[PDB]
Design a protein around this ligand. Sequence first.
Ligand code: TYD
Length: 395
Amino acid sequence: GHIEGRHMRVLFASLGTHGHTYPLLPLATAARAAGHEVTFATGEGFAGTLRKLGFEPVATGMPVFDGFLAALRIRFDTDSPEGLTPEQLSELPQIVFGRVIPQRVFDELQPVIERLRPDLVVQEISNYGAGLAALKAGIPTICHGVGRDTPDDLTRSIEEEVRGLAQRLGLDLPPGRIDGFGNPFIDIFPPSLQEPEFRARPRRHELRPVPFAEQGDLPAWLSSRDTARPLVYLTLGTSSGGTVEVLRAAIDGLAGLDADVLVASGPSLDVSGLGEVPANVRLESWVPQAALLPHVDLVVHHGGSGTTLGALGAGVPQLSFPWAGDSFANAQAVAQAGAGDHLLPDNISPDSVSGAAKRLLAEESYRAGARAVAAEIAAMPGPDEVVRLLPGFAS
Ligand SMILES: Cc1cn([C@H]2C[C@H](O)[C@@H](COP(=O)(O)OP(=O)(O)O)O2)c(=O)[nH]c1=O
């Protein structure tokens, strides 16, 4: 038992992937420092990290792969994607994140919210199941964004599946876009790069896109490299951002440069077949990306929001290979700010990557564009400032 606005029970809830869980960590940490009790619901795999942050971890949802198996069965009556055209497979995402996962998360959070009786729920934008659970339980909720607003087909499809799931759960949602379930919205995307319409949205609040501070060690070789030549960082994320074929094409393109290349392949990408690489290319399974970026001269990636905002925050030029989800939205934002460039899925090769990487390194305008947003980001309200709003949200 606590008094109003002090030592609150705040329930953070996000999808079970790094790209969706990490963005909320800074605010959760700030909430704990403010004296609130943080319970964090997400993939069980994050349990260790959450506990170390002082949070009480809760396991929800399922691995993305398992989600696509479910959708695969629901939609195509099969256990394999084999024989299915990329157009048929592109019908699955809305089922996975609009129905299958939300259903699971809703089922698991209902009893959780029941016992925890949280004063406030911080719902990750794409974690609709958590939004529905809190809605039914009548808990004051705020929507925590992970990137740029995306008013595209993919998002609308996912939202309609969410609507269908809502109906079946006895929850009648308002007509029109989900729009964070009409709750206050925490926007971590650089306002200048944010969709104009969305930036005007009422009850919207800025929050600096702080990169998760992991206490891991940087690769030791950084301490003895030729710091007179560029350091290039290559990564395709942690969830379906790109393929190993694309990673191979990027390595061949970057390896030729007079530069050091650090590659982080992540937990999902199988690189057992990647093969041989020149000595200036180092392959890592995982790196403390937040601590790394300040040392980097160029970030080459899949276009994930976390790495996009990360590069922007560090004032580093970025080359992206947009293909999945909001990767295209982020590519537009980067182009708008002249903070980097991109190559389309049919234009990925050693040559195209090499040429683009050289341009982003040689021409100052790209770094200049990145430094501009880095300043804007630094001027945004920090987690400790925004956290002072939580009591008002709960009340
Ligand atoms: C591959 C890799 C990712 N990360 C983190 C940084 C980002 O916050 C997050 C990647 O998320 P993001 O860049 O949004 O792409 P996706 O959501 O497709 O994974 O994972 C590391 O910290 N170290 C690593 O080696």
